[PDB]
Amino acid sequence: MKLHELKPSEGSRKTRNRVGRGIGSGNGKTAGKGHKGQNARSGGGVRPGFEGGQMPLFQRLPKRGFTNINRKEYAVVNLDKLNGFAEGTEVTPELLLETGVISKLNAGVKILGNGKLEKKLTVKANKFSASAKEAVEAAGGTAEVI
Amino acid sequence: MHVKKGDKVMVISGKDKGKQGTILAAFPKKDRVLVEGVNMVKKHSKPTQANPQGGISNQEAPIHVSNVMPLDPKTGEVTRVGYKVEDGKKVRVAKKSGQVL
Amino acid sequence: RKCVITGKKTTAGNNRSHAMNASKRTWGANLQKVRILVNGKPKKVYVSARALKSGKVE
Amino acid sequence: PKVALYNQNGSTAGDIELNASVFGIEPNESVVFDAILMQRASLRQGTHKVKNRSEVRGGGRKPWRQKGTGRARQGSIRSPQWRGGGVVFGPTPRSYSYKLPKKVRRLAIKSVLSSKVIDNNIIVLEDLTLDTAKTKEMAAILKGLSVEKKALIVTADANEAVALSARNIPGVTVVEANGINVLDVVNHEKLLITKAAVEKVEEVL
RNA sequence: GAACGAGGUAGAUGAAGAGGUCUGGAAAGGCCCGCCAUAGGAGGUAACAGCCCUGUAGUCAAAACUUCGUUCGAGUGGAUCCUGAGUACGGCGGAACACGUGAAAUUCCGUCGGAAUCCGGGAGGACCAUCUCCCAAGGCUAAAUACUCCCUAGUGACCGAUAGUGAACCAGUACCGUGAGGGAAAGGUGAAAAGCACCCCGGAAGGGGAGUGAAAGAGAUCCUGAAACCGUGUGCC
RNA sequence: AACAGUGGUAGGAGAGCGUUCUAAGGGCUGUGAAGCCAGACCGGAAGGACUGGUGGAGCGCUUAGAAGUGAGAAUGCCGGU
């Protein structure tokens, strides 16, 4: 790439669809916004979810929400990222962070059971699904619960 | 203003080259120097106070300092100007020699 | 000439009634001066009044 | 990469085969486009400003009646149709920079370096040490390298014999290996490295 | 309270070609050559300059006023007392907290029968116990941070006179308004005033010559000078 | 190459023209640029040159980037008539 011959990959640049310069290109007089509407004036108009006076959809539906303080986003492992390791290695939540397995330890590492293993592993973690407890034992690995 | 009134000024360029001479007057606020011979224009004058002959007078016009360089007192050469101190007052020093003035 | 609960005391402002020759005269502490416990700790000094329901009950 | 090497005198010496991880990639010409428009963007301070309809020192009154009279509506003495005028939209103070991801800017440097290996405008010169900072010595080196155009020198750790020199030469600027400028490597179009800076390039990438 | 060091309020020093030629009114331009550089930022000079000039790099400079920075009372008890007095605490007044008084904490800031005080007190979103955290009701407190009227230095994919500060100019003026206030318009001779002596026309104003300047149609709201518009002539109707 | 279609407002979609400024190259200018003034030139279009006359110092192209991005209508502003 010389400075004399700068060019993009075609499709990574695209000129303006600039609005309101002459009727030749289109969008000249009305400037893309039609005839005399409320949706043509200087910013006056509508909220996003508004229906002109009819009861908007977010109210005629009931409130079924309730949020506790004490919730726990458990870390989600599909049990198949342990196949990236070899058998007989250490499985700790401090190890799952820096290996790129879990990007964020949100106070709890639960191990799910989709898929399968073939590797005897020293698995210690906070909580376990029931099929994951047997799948680690199916590979002969230990199933310590932190 | 690196040139003193009454030196041996050489004219660099302008309407007249070649001629050298002496300063008759100076204008350091306007950065212009009046030198004999060069930049002589024929000026009209009305018959008024200070000798009402009128007519077309004859005098020289001032020249900007950048056309003005002094010659060498050692060779007769257009040299640049430096500065030294010789027992007291700062003196002008011509380049390409150990000359003064 | 004060207490510790809302910002209105011996201060400096306005009034224009009649007969019309004028300067400085008073808003004072509106006392009728007896105990409370919103702070039960005594000397029996000044009181003023913006509102007196739900000071306390008893 | 089998790039040749010369001396500080300029005589031909033993070459260096470079590393294909840095100098032997394919030239990714799509990245180099969007590489330079990052660095060109954050050389503009953009401190331009225009007084709007409000910052106009006046305005205010309906300059006459609205009816009874003859003119148009014309409802303040500094509206944008007027001659004194507040510009309608105008330019406002801002930035222009945006930090590209790290995997781009690693690859963006390397494709330029791998290109200049093919373009052969690159010479490694170990131990560029000088007695004085005189650019006359610097000019003698450049004519000894047959460089009559723009050029760039990568020092190891900004040796002041090189650094105080060559700032007076127009086509040659001095920079250290910590400051490998993605514009200037493309800009100066011929390039010089010290041998200590060669591994200093290699130790970071 | 004294001495030193650095900075500021004036400064100084400072490299290398009228290089030869060609056009041009005029070389800094073109051509053919040199040269300096810790200086090829910038301005100025008859036009576009590293080496033409002021100056810039670099290094030094302060009588005096200053500015910043350097140097000349521990432990152990466990009798007693104290540890913040006219306030701290809640459910019905107000206000600030994201919280519109609600389940309403908490902080204070006007107000309705006057708690304790170390075996104590307060808080942990009413409250209750438990549990951990902490002694409120006296005061002081730098840095990081908010900002520009000026100053110093210098930037710009900022403006180039209807733009940019209202104001590039005697501009917050001239004028409008008794009034608070409102608030304009208007930069360019050349490189050098060398700015027109002299002769005619007329009372001039104003020309026509001449002379000045490379250009005088360049000559005084003075570069370029379009269109509206006012024209004078003439080809065809 | 063959076949087919091409009126269009609101309205969507795609290509390009051009001014100001910057960016590397290149060049072109006191042997006369920008502008202005004329024509019978070329490009499908916005358009773009080329001589001639004015003017007396700067400005185009090729590819990029940024936009105060282009007038003929606002009982439009401001001059000139």
Curated annotation (Swiss-Prot), chain A:
The cross-references to Pfam families, in alphabetical order and at most eight, read: Ribosomal_L27A
What ranges does the record list as Basic and acidic residues composition bias?
1-13
Q: What keyword terms does UniProt attach to this protein?
A: Ribonucleoprotein, Ribosomal protein, RNA-binding, rRNA-binding
Q: Write down the PROSITE patterns for this protein, in alphabetical order.
A: RIBOSOMAL_L15 (PS00475)
**Cellular component annotations (GO), alphabetically ordered:** cytosolic large ribosomal subunit
Q: Which GO terms describe its biological process?
A: translation
- How does the record describe its quaternary structure? Part of the 50S ribosomal subunit.
Instruction: State what protein this is by name.
Output: Large ribosomal subunit protein uL15
InterPro entries registered for this protein in UniProt: Ribosomal_uL15, Ribosomal_uL15/eL18, Ribosomal_uL15/eL18_sf, Ribosomal_uL15_bac-type, Ribosomal_uL15_CS
Organism of this sequence: Bacillus subtilis (strain 168)
Q: Which residue windows are coiled coil?
A: none
Q: State the encoding gene.
A: rplO
User: Where does the source fall among the domains of life?
Assistant: Bacteria
Which family, according to the similarity comment? Belongs to the universal ribosomal protein uL15 family.
Q: Where is this region: Disordered?
A: 1-57
Question: GO: which molecular function terms?
Answer: rRNA binding; structural constituent of ribosome
Task performed by this protein: Binds to the 23S rRNA.
Instruction: Return the Gly residues bias intervals.
Output: 21-31, 42-52
Query: Which HAMAP family did the record assign?
Result: Ribosomal_uL15
Swiss-Prot record, chain B:
Which NCBIfam families does this chain map to? rplX_bact
Quaternary structure and interacting proteins, as annotated: Part of the 50S ribosomal subunit.
Q: Where in the cell is it found?
A: Cytoplasm; Cytoplasm, Nucleoid
What name does the UniProt record give this protein? Large ribosomal subunit protein uL24
Q: Which InterPro entries match?
A: KOW (IPR005824), Rib_uL2_dom2 (IPR014722), Ribosomal_uL24 (IPR003256), Ribosomal_uL24_CS (IPR005825), Ribosomal_uL24_KOW (IPR041988), Translation_prot_SH3-like_sf (IPR008991)
Q: What function does this protein fulfil?
A: One of two assembly initiator proteins, it binds directly to the 5'-end of the 23S rRNA, where it nucleates assembly of the 50S subunit. One of the proteins that surrounds the polypeptide exit tunnel on the outside of the subunit.
GO cellular component terms attached to this protein's record = cytosolic large ribosomal subunit; nucleoid
Keyword terms: Cytoplasm, DNA-binding, Ribonucleoprotein, Ribosomal protein, RNA-binding, rRNA-binding
Keyword DNA repair appears in the UniProt entry: no
GO biological process, any = translation
Curated annotation (Swiss-Prot), chain C:
Q: Which InterPro entries match?
A: Bacterial_rp_bL28 (IPR050096), Ribosomal_bL28 (IPR026569), Ribosomal_bL28/bL31-like_sf (IPR034704), Ribosomal_bL28_bact-type (IPR001383), Ribosomal_bL28_sf (IPR037147)
Is-annotated flag, keyword Signal? no
Write out the entry's keywords from A to Z. Ribonucleoprotein, Ribosomal protein
Biological-process GO terms, alphabetical: translation
Gene3D superfamilies in alphabetical order:
Ribosomal protein L28/L24
| Family matches, as SUPFAM superfamilies | L28p-like
Q: List GO terms (cellular component aspect).
A: ribonucleoprotein complex; ribosome
Q: Which domain of life is it from?
A: Bacteria
A molecular function annotated in GO for this UniProt entry is: structural constituent of ribosome
Task: Kindly give the PANTHER family that the UniProt entry links to this protein.
Answer: 50S RIBOSOMAL PROTEIN L28 (PTHR39080), LARGE RIBOSOMAL SUBUNIT PROTEIN BL28A (PTHR39080:SF1)
The annotated subunit structure for this chain is: Part of the 50S ribosomal subunit.
Family designation:
Belongs to the bacterial ribosomal protein bL28 family.
Q: Which NCBIfam families match?
A: L28 (TIGR00009)
The entry's protein name is Large ribosomal subunit protein bL28
UniProtKB/Swiss-Prot annotation, chain D:
GO cellular component terms? Answer: ribonucleoprotein complex; ribosome
Pfam families to which the protein is assigned, alphabetical: Ribosomal_L4
Subunit architecture: Part of the 50S ribosomal subunit.
- Quote the InterPro entries the UniProt record gives: Ribosomal_uL4 (IPR002136), Ribosomal_uL4-like (IPR013005), Ribosomal_uL4_dom_sf (IPR023574)
Per the record, which residues fall in region Disordered? Answer: 47-84
Annotated protein name in UniProt: Large ribosomal subunit protein uL4
UniProt keyword list: Ribonucleoprotein, Ribosomal protein, RNA-binding, rRNA-binding
List the Gene Ontology MF annotations in alphabetical order.
rRNA binding; structural constituent of ribosome
